[PDB]
Each structure stands twice: as C-alpha cells, then as structure tokens.
C-alpha cells in the first residue's frame, strides 16, 4: 500500500542537556542525557481521525525522522539521532512501513500516541531534537 | 508607485485535507478540499496603523503569494496555489498593484481584512498553504 | 576556556518600523527606529541553571549575533545590526569572550538578563531583527 497525506502535523520537541543545564527564555521540555534510558517517555501526540470509516489511519514521519523500520527525533544540527518507539495508548494493532505508522484496521480512530526512547541512549549529544508526524491514511 | 515596509507581518495558514482527515497534535486551521467553495473564508487578518495620518496604509504579499494581479496562498513546496480575494470588512476602498494591497486614501486605518477563496477550488491538492502579508505604506 | 552547549535557546525578536507603522496580525514586539534610543530595552531573558554548582553558567550568541566583543540583533537578511548590551539584573559579574557571555563565578545561577540598545541607533533600517542565545557552561 502507500501513504496519502491528509491531515495535520504534530511536532514533538525535546532539548537534551548535560547535568549542568541552563534554561534560557521560555519554558521548554528538557531532559539530561542521563534520563534517556530505555522506554523513557518523550511525550504524547494526540490523534483524531474523521471521515475515515473505510480507511486505515496513518502517521508519516518527516524524511529526517526515520530510516527503514526505525524512527528517531533528529537534532537541529540535522545529524544527531534519538531513536524512539511510537505506541498507541489503547494497545491497538499498528504496522510500521518505511516512515509510516499505520493502523491495521479501518475506522476513524481517536487516540493518543506515546513516544518513548528506544534503547538506552544516555550518551546522546546535547541539542534540540524534533520528531514530526503528519496525519493521513494507508491504502 | 512604491511600497515602504514599515510594520509587522501576518501569516495566514491553512492545511488542506481529503475527506478522511487525520488531525495530529494541537488544533490548527484545517479544511477538506471540498470545503474550498467560492468565497469560503480562510481567515481574518487584523490591521492597525499608527502615525500614518499622511500616508496610504498598505499590505505587501510575499513574492511567492502573488502573480499577474492575483493573490494566492502557496503550498510548502511553492508549487500549488489557492487563489484568494482580500477584502476589508468596512466600506473602504483599496487597490491592488503588483503584490501590494493599498488603501486609496491616507490615514491611520485600523480594521479587519478577510481572506476568502476566489472561485471554487475543491480539487486543491492536500498540503500546507500560507499567505504572508507585511504592513507598510504606499506612494506613487 | 570554552563553551559547552547544555540548555535551551532563547530568541529575542524585534520588528523595527518607521513612524507610520502598520501592525498586521497578532501583536509582536515592535519599535519605531526613533524609539531605539541609548539603553532602550529590547527585552528580558529569563535564565535558570540547575546542576551547575561547580561550573560557570554561560550564554552563547548565534554566530550571526556577535563580532569583536560586540553583540547585536541581526536583520533577517543578515546585513543590518542593532548593537546591544547584555546585563544581568542582579549586577553580578560576567565576562564576554567571542560570542560567549559567561558568569565569572561558578554556581547554578537563576536570574534575568536584560538586552538593551547600546548607543542611540535611531537610523536602524526597518526590518525584523533577532538575537539568539543558547544556554551552557564555560570551562577553563
């Protein structure tokens, strides 16, 4: 099948720091690299489909947020990666296919996707990281 | 005539989708392409001029948002256009000149500019569209 | 010594206009060029350090925001500078070193850094100016 973009885009942001951490300006979600242990939560992403009674709901990551079957937040330097797993909170069945995370069943799903650290990465370089997901459907 | 940039910039954004629409994250302005009917409102843009008692208030569209006396929101990839009309909500008269929408008389105008779909465009490709307007003043 | 980025980034923005000023869309920080008098405030920057009991808290300006021990907001096109002084409100001692503004003492400082116009610059060209500061620490 293939992804058809049809929806809005959610960006999950995380600033990764060392132990001595200097917050400058507006409050922003930050973690020290020591907090990037396996399964550590990064954040939730709300998803609400409508008009999808006969389509499989899908999310597509930006090109700089995936490599084959793996997802990652990408540093603002465009290089450094923070690998993550993406999981619905209702434990419904989804499939990953080259940047696309799509629901196995048709229907206008409403849910919450959690983004978690995939494998211990406590040596991740400091930086401002982002994962960008766009709604659509899989056919 | 010429436009002098002097003010701030308003960005009008719209995400166009198909009927099966998947909203991800925070609520943002989205429409299905079927909702892109003639005169459908894209959004308001508030304008307030100060110190322009002797100048003609003006809004300049970004280069990528105008051509041939026509304004349009443009997709993120610069390819796809969504043509619009730009209209103040009061009785005031304005002129379009090469990407600049300027008021026909001088004065520190304040008001609401509506951006509307110009001609039914229900086949617009899904994507993120933007129209950027910068305040300033115009003169011949 | 040298700077280690470790913290979040604060962006200070200002739109400079002429006397006839046309605000478009949401309110943003704007000043006429005539308001760019000596020491005119551009804005505050809240700073809170944690885990730095043994390091010197530091802010590093983007490469396009510093020169010759001078800091400045820069216009969108990277040409026009608006020189500023950066000063903590508690008048603690800090040092400037090639784009880094670091605290002379060690410790997890919590404070407010004010950004102010350095010398009257009432001829600054209208445009959008930005100063970007990143949190980290200085080490010898």
UniProtKB/Swiss-Prot annotation, chain A:
SUPFAM superfamilies: Bacterial adhesins
Subcellular location as annotated: Fimbrium
GO cellular component, one term: pilus
Region (Receptor-binding): 2-55
A Pfam entry, by short name: Adhesin_Dr
Keywords for the protein's UniProt record, in alphabetical order: Fimbrium, Signal
Disulfide bonds: none
Keyword Metal-binding in annotation: no
Gene3D superfamilies, alphabetized: Dr adhesin (2.60.40.1570)
Chief localisation class: other
Protein family per UniProt: Belongs to the Dr-adhesin family.
Summary of the function given for this chain in its UniProt record: Hemagglutinins of uropathogenic E.coli mediate adherence to the upper urinary tract. These adhesins bind to the Dr blood group antigen and also agglutinate human erythrocytes in the presence of D-mannose (mannose-resistant hemagglutination (MRHA)).
The protein's name in its UniProt record: Dr hemagglutinin structural subunit
């Amino acid at each position: 099948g293939s992804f058809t973009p049809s929806g809005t885009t959610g960006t999950t942001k995380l600033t990764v720091t060392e132990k001595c951490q200097v917050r400058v300006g507006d409050l922003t979600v930050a973690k020290t690299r020591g907090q990037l242990t396996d399964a550590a939560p990064i954040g939730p992403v709300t998803v609400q489909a409508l008009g999808c009674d006969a389509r499989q709901v899908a999310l597509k990551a930006d090109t700089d947020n995936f490599e084959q079957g793996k997802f990652f937040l990408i540093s603002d330097n465009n290089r450094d990666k923070l690998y993550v797993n993406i999981r619905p909170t209702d434990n419904s069945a989804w499939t990953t296919d080259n940047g696309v995370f799509y629901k196995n069943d048709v229907g206008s799903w409403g849910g919450i996707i959690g983004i978690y650290v995939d494998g211990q990465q406590t040596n991740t370089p400091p930086g401002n990281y982002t994962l960008t997901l766009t709604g659509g459907y899989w056919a």
